[PDB]
Amino acid sequence: QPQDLEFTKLPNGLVIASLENYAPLSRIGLFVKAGSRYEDSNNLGTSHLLRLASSLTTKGASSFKITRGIEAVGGKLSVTATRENMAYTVEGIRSDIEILMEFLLNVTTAPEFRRWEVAALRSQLKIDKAVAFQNSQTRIIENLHDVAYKNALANPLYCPDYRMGKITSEELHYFVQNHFTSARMALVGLGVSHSVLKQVAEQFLNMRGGLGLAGAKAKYRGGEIREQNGDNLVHAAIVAESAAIGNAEANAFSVLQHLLGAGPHIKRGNNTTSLLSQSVAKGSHQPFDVSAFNASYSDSGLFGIYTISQAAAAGEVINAAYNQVKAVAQGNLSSADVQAAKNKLKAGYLMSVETSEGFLSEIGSQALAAGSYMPPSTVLQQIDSVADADVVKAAKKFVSGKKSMAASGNLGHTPFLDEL
Amino acid sequence: KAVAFQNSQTRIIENLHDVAYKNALANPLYCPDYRMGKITSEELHYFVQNHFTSARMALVGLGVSHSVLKQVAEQFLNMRGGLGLAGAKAKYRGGEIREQNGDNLVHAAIVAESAAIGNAEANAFSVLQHLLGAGPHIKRGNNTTSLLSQSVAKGSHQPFDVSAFNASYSDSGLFGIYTISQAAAAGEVINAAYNQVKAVAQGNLSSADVQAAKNKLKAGYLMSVETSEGFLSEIGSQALAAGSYMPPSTVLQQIDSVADADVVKAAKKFVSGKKSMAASGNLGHTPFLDEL
Amino acid sequence: MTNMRKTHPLFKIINHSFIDLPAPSNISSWWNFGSLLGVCLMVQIITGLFLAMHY
Amino acid sequence: MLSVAARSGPFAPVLSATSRGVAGALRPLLQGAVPAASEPPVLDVKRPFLCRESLSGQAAARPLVATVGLNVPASVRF
Amino acid sequence: LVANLLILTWIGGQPVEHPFIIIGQLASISYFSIILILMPISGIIEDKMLKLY
Amino acid sequence: TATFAQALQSVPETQVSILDNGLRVASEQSSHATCTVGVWIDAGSRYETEKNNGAGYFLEHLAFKGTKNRPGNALEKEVESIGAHLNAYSTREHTAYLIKALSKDLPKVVELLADIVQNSSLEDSQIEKERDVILREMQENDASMQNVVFDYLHATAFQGTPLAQAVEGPSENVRRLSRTDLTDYLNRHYKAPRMVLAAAGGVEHQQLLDLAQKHLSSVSRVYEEDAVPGLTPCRFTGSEIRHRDDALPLAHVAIAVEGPGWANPDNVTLQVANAIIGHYDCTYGGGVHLSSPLASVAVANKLCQSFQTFNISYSDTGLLGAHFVCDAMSIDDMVFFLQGQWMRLCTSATESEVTRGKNILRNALVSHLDGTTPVCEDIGRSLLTYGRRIPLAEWESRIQEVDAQMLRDICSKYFYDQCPAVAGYGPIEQLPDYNRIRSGMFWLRF
Amino acid sequence: TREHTAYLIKALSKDLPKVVELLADIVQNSSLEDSQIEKERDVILREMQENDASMQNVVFDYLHATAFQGTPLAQAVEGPSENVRRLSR
Amino acid sequence: SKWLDGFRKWYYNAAGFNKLGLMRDDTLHETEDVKEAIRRLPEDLYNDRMFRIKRALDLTMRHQILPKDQWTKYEEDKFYLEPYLKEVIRERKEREEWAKK
Amino acid sequence: LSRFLGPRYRELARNWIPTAGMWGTVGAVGLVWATDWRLILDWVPYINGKF
Numbered sequence A: 001q002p003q004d005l006e007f008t009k010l011p012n013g014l015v016i017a018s019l020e021n022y023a024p025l026s027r028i029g030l031f032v033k034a035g036s037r038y039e040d041s042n043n044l045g046t047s048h049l050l051r052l053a054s055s056l057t058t059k060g061a062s063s064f065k066i067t068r069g070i071e072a073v074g075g076k077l078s079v080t081a082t083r084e085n086m087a088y089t090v091e092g093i094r095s096d097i098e099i100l101m102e103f104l105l106n107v108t109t110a111p112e113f114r115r116w117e118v119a120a121l122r123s124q125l126k127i128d129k130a131v132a133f134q135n136s137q138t139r140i141i142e143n144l145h146d147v148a149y150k151n152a153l154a155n156p157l158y159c160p161d162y163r164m165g166k167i168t169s170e171e172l173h174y175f176v177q178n179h180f181t182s183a184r185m186a187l188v189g190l191g192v193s194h195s196v197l198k199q200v201a202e203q204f205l206n207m208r209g210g211l212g213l214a215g216a217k218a219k220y221r222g223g224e225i226r227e228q229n230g231d232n233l234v235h236a237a238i239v240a241e242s243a244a245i246g247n248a249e250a251n252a253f254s255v256l257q258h259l260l261g262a263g264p265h266i267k268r269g270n271n272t273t274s275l276l277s278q279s280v281a282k283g284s285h286q287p288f289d290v291s292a293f294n295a296s297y298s299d300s301g302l303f304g305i306y307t308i309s310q311a312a313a314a315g316e317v318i319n320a321a322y323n324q325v326k327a328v329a330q331g332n333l334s335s336a337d338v339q340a341a342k343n344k345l346k347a348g349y350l351m352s353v354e355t356s357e358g359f360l361s362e363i364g365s366q367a368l369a370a371g372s373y374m375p376p377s378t379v380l381q382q383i384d385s386v387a388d389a390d391v392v393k394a395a396k397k398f399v400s401g402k403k404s405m406a407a408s409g410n411l412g413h414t415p416f417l418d419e420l
Numbered sequence B: 001k002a003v004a005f006q007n008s009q010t011r012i013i014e015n016l017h018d019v020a021y022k023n024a025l026a027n028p029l030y031c032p033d034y035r036m037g038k039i040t041s042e043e044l045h046y047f048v049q050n051h052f053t054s055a056r057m058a059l060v061g062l063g064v065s066h067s068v069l070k071q072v073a074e075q076f077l078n079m080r081g082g083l084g085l086a087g088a089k090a091k092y093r094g095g096e097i098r099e100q101n102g103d104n105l106v107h108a109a110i111v112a113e114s115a116a117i118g119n120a121e122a123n124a125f126s127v128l129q130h131l132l133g134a135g136p137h138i139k140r141g142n143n144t145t146s147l148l149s150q151s152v153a154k155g156s157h158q159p160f161d162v163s164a165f166n167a168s169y170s171d172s173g174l175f176g177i178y179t180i181s182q183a184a185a186a187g188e189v190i191n192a193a194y195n196q197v198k199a200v201a202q203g204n205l206s207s208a209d210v211q212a213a214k215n216k217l218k219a220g221y222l223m224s225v226e227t228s229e230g231f232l233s234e235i236g237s238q239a240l241a242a243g244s245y246m247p248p249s250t251v252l253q254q255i256d257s258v259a260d261a262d263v264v265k266a267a268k269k270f271v272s273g274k275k276s277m278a279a280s281g282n283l284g285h286t287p288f289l290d291e292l
Numbered sequence C: 001m002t003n004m005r006k007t008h009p010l011f012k013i014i015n016h017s018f019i020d021l022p023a024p025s026n027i028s029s030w031w032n033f034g035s036l037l038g039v040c041l042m043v044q045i046i047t048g049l050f051l052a053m054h055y
Numbered sequence D: 001m002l003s004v005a006a007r008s009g010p011f012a013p014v015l016s017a018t019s020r021g022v023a024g025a026l027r028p029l030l031q032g033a034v035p036a037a038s039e040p041p042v043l044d045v046k047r048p049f050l051c052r053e054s055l056s057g058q059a060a061a062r063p064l065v066a067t068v069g070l071n072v073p074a075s076v077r078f
Numbered sequence E: 001l002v003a004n005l006l007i008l009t010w011i012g013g014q015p016v017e018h019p020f021i022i023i024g025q026l027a028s029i030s031y032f033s034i035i036l037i038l039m040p041i042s043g044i045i046e047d048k049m050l051k052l053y
Numbered sequence F: 001t002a003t004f005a006q007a008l009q010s011v012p013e014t015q016v017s018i019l020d021n022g023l024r025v026a027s028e029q030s031s032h033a034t035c036t037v038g039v040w041i042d043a044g045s046r047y048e049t050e051k052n053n054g055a056g057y058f059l060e061h062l063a064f065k066g067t068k069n070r071p072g073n074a075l076e077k078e079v080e081s082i083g084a085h086l087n088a089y090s091t092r093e094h095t096a097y098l099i100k101a102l103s104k105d106l107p108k109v110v111e112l113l114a115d116i117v118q119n120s121s122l123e124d125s126q127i128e129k130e131r132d133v134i135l136r137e138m139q140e141n142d143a144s145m146q147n148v149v150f151d152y153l154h155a156t157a158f159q160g161t162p163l164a165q166a167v168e169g170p171s172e173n174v175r176r177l178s179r180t181d182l183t184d185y186l187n188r189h190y191k192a193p194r195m196v197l198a199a200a201g202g203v204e205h206q207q208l209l210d211l212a213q214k215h216l217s218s219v220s221r222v223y224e225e226d227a228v229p230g231l232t233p234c235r236f237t238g239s240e241i242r243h244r245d246d247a248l249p250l251a252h253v254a255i256a257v258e259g260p261g262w263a264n265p266d267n268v269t270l271q272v273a274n275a276i277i278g279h280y281d282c283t284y285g286g287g288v289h290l291s292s293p294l295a296s297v298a299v300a301n302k303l304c305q306s307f308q309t310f311n312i313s314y315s316d317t318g319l320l321g322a323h324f325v326c327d328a329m330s331i332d333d334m335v336f337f338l339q340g341q342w343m344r345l346c347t348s349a350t351e352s353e354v355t356r357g358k359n360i361l362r363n364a365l366v367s368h369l370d371g372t373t374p375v376c377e378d379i380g381r382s383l384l385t386y387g388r389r390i391p392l393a394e395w396e397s398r399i400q401e402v403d404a405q406m407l408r409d410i411c412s413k414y415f416y417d418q419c420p421a422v423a424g425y426g427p428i429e430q431l432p433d434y435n436r437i438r439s440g441m442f443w444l445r446f
Numbered sequence G: 001t002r003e004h005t006a007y008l009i010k011a012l013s014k015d016l017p018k019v020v021e022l023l024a025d026i027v028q029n030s031s032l033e034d035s036q037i038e039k040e041r042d043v044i045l046r047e048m049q050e051n052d053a054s055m056q057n058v059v060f061d062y063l064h065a066t067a068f069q070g071t072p073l074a075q076a077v078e079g080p081s082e083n084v085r086r087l088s089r
Numbered sequence H: 001s002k003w004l005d006g007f008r009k010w011y012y013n014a015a016g017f018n019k020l021g022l023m024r025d026d027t028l029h030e031t032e033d034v035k036e037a038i039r040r041l042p043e044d045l046y047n048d049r050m051f052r053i054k055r056a057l058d059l060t061m062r063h064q065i066l067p068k069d070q071w072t073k074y075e076e077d078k079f080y081l082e083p084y085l086k087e088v089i090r091e092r093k094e095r096e097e098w099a100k101k
Numbered sequence I: 001l002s003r004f005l006g007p008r009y010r011e012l013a014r015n016w017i018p019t020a021g022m023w024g025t026v027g028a029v030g031l032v033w034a035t036d037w038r039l040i041l042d043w044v045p046y047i048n049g050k051f
Ligand code: HEM
Pocket: C041, C044, C045, C046, C047, C048, C049, C051, C052, C055
């Protein structure tokens, strides 16, 4: 007997969301508005060490006790972080989630941050950054955010090279005390009852309840940065400012990326409904990969094109992709293409929420954003409420706005922003 | 490369050229990190065979006669081809690179396009450099006649150093302001220096200051050609750039031919030109190009 | 190159055991005694060998 | 649809960093390893600048000049 | 203990008459009692007196 | 509240029907608005006879390039039109063509799958293009070291059998096979009794059965010459392949012994043994407090970059062992510690680590069975291998009957004094030769 | 240095007289103002703090201090910091 | 009581490590727990401890003691290593109990 | 020696009793064979012919 989602907002600001579906493995996550955008130039990379410091000694359980107790029941504790949000998630058998909530709420609420532990963790910070930047997409997206924004969203997800060896226990304590407050936290549980979740919520985090430290508004700057590193393929992202979280223009931009192309649906396919892929493939016979990039955060968004191409043919491919968006900015589109884009977007949303951890991430993000769970059918009808003129308006907003460009590879034939 | 990049203004100049040019002047003087372990012998042979040719070389001797130098020139330097490869004309882009590395001192350089070598206006730019300060004249001095130091020093109680940067190449130019300041007061130092250059560009200057800048430029040239190494560097640069030897008296004469209205025009060209910025340090308070 | 005391394989053992061996500065005369034992052992062997030449 | 995994389809692992404090039962795809990155050379530290009087002259004014030698240390002028 | 070893060395060169038997017996008993019992008890007392635990 | 037992027993059962051709039609219903519908075929590289060693892979490339009814990219235009996702994969024993779609698009998807299994037009220009594509993707697949190491392990462990040959096949066969070899492979190995139509998620079983009767009826059912192929057992060989290339930065080493097979239940016990050893890579945040002794000693001595344990199962055979990635100067030490752990599981297994391994296996099974795609994958593999879908309650019963005594008995049966297969790639000079590994496969103290 | 002091001007030849009397204005008629004394005391203290991080200057000062013990050749040109704090006009 | 405190000061003077300038925690034998607690020390206390040990070794080398005004007095003998040692001991007991069960 | 007083160490000791007993049997048989002990070899039937 699966019931519906059930929500209470506690008077200290903490959101509690629960769903009891009688799953054999139950999953409990806690969502904090403490991403990398809340740092400044004095404590860069603190959120990366905080993300990697989830298995440290807490006031209530040591590192040995936390690690051996989570592995004793076979449960899993993971930390996922975006530029806005952090989420600490535990999952396991229903008979062990009491001590799993003990461990998770101890980790969230009462860390110790001993100096020898963080001194041991900084080498793991370097190793994690190297493993993350082993692929070109991660480096080019970090570079794109750094050149696109000025202060808030320009902060990297991974710690800079100079800041390793300089992050202290006091910076971690200050970050936790200024951003891990009850008004910025949602505790979301799939496979758990409401009563046990709300009672462990009221007997763990009953000491902090404020709004925390407010972050600065993100400011666009634009520009371009180029990384000549001699790779075989040229990666290039060209974006502009777009809509934020909470507007119908964000829905228009999502429909616009699914019209332009947002990943292959067929293994080794040709992408014959992707306008960018068709416009490149009608002129270039070299291997390529052209898609549309959209990343929207609660105050600002980035929308643009992403290209991977050969070094000799890096130019006109980018130009071809850009020209295709200009055609969409001129009204050159068909209603069947927009209907197929809407179907692709809604199928992608439903397959994103069909898994348990994706469902928990969606519920936690919605509880942080608004404090209530929006049903999927209303999301479907608000996707269906997007018109063609909104897609044309989003395309002309992209082509009229000033650009941020991140390029990497052999950039001898990669064009500049003024040459576009 | 590590020994050269040990100090920050080398990396600032490299990043500034990479900001300022699309090609043919933005190539670094030092080898990039990925190119280490990959430069081969045939690439060096290709570079020497295409650029070390006879029409691009000057043999200059101090302490030798012309006969010995010309006979080793005809016995060695006759087997090469001609003019070699042309180049790529060094087109301008502009922009900004900010390198956050958490130094105690913020180094910033804001530059714009200026005249090339051989243009008369470049000489005016040189005078403009000595109008703004191209280095100290007293060991531990206050730089009283430096306009940038006078404009910044009245609002700073903590250490700084501001100068005018001038770089003339055979097809291009780069004139701007170099600032070194604290992290918390980089914005006011940069804004004060930029406002000083803007005040120079609006015709607010003294003829005595222009005469002092001319005297500084003439003394700097005559002290640069004082040693034998600087003299032979000057002769080789003149022979490569113009194919003739220009006497120092003629150099001082064309320095004295510069008008102050040309200095105003050079400052106005810097102010109205598109800017290029390279910054490093703790850049939490360093302004952007549109914020100036 | 010519640091034979630390490159010759025989000589580096004598070096590592008796020349460049890091010893505490403050050890008293009691720490002499074991070395005496080794020397005394050698003395015994030598005297015993000559005592073995006629016994 | 207020999430980076629901709104950014292919760009989910590049806008998000997922670490594990305690490993789960299932091993992650693409385990990854660091292939022994090289050590930068050890250089002697340069003096700092704590007064205006020694900062005077540190700003560049001329183009970059590099110089190497057979038995002369390498130098750079500004 | 060193004094007791000196006493045992003296007794070992003496024949078995009074009071060498009882002196050697008390010497050996005190030797084994000092090595096996008294020294760790003394070390524990010293750790108490130095406020270690 | 509900404990683990009735939470496992509240999982909906997988209902299986059969058409007149012998085609299995299996489905499991959930509350999701999406669904995953796939076709599983008992056809892999084990059924190939070294003259058509890349036929399944190259047909897997050609299967989405157009059919007779839907010529060319118009076919994939259809699977773009509903926003569905189309995937296919091939192993040494099974081939799968699966579609993730919405529930309301259930008929057309099934019809699409029908074309993919019985109407694929193999154009010759498309054959040349996919031949070049397969050549370039082998040219990028040999850069990935673990695929090379596992292929080397399969080759040296199943020498002389059809289980040694890779799924992709050699490059000469890619340059050599024509359309008639593909047609013969398609008419030989795509038989209806060797096929399962599996559906997971928001599907009704009666509607899916009616759609399979409408579209998937009368595939072949007849081998056309009364020439039925037969599955042949594969000889395991304790052996060693060492590909030394000192320019690579890291070394990958896999050591395995013979596995029991799909139908042998002690696999479950062996899985618990793997859960005792576990996996590790350098980004794990546990530090020195990891429960696995191998992972703890690897973190403590900075030995490995990663390791993992595997139990690969084929029809009454398999490979049970460990694969680790590390630099050269650690390799021998890693081998030593790994072998010690195996012998400890043969000799000194205690109840606490057995309980931990049982909990890890329970979490692994239930967390793997999450989403429509892995449930459909499990249904297809269960109907192909076991002939039935084993429910999670039976898995829990077989897990809870495992204790320490039968774990060390089964581990002594499969690990102790056995000849392993070793595959190394990279700077593997300090990797010990076969006598030292074989001597490390037992203890002189028992 | 430890034994010599130099005040030198680089100039043009035609400015040769004025430069000479500028030198005659420096080594003969110096005015030593007290607020300037305080400012240069702070400047010298932080300049010695700067010189502390240059290891060859520290090593050569140590070499002089251990090679010329008990003599005026051991002491540095800058002197100790306490003398910098209490030198008067 | 007060008599026990006076006798403990007398025993502290009879122990004689105060004559070399050593603290109480400087004289601890470096076991595994003691080395871990030393490794957990801040760098100022670490440098003070090893300078005190070096000075004590130098004084023992020349068979001398400090002047009596420079002796470590009883009421300024701060137990700096003791809480780190308690932390290391308690976590080692926790690991021992987990391995025991 | 209270470190090794637990259920896991008791299970390890119980598991290693038969191997240690078999090794003790090996040592006793080897000692009797090497020393040619008459208290045992006079009872084994085929060994009686050499005495
Ligand atoms: C390998 C070297 C040695 C040899 C060849 C050796 C040989 C001899 C010989 C031949 C004698 C009999 C001569 C005599 O009575 O003085 C002797 C006596 C003796 N040796 Fe050694 N010896 C050796 C080492 C030692 C050592 C290491 C000790 C112990 C410290 C030792 C203790 C004695 C003693 C106590 C006597 C009896 C002395 C006496 O009563 O006259 N010997 N040895």
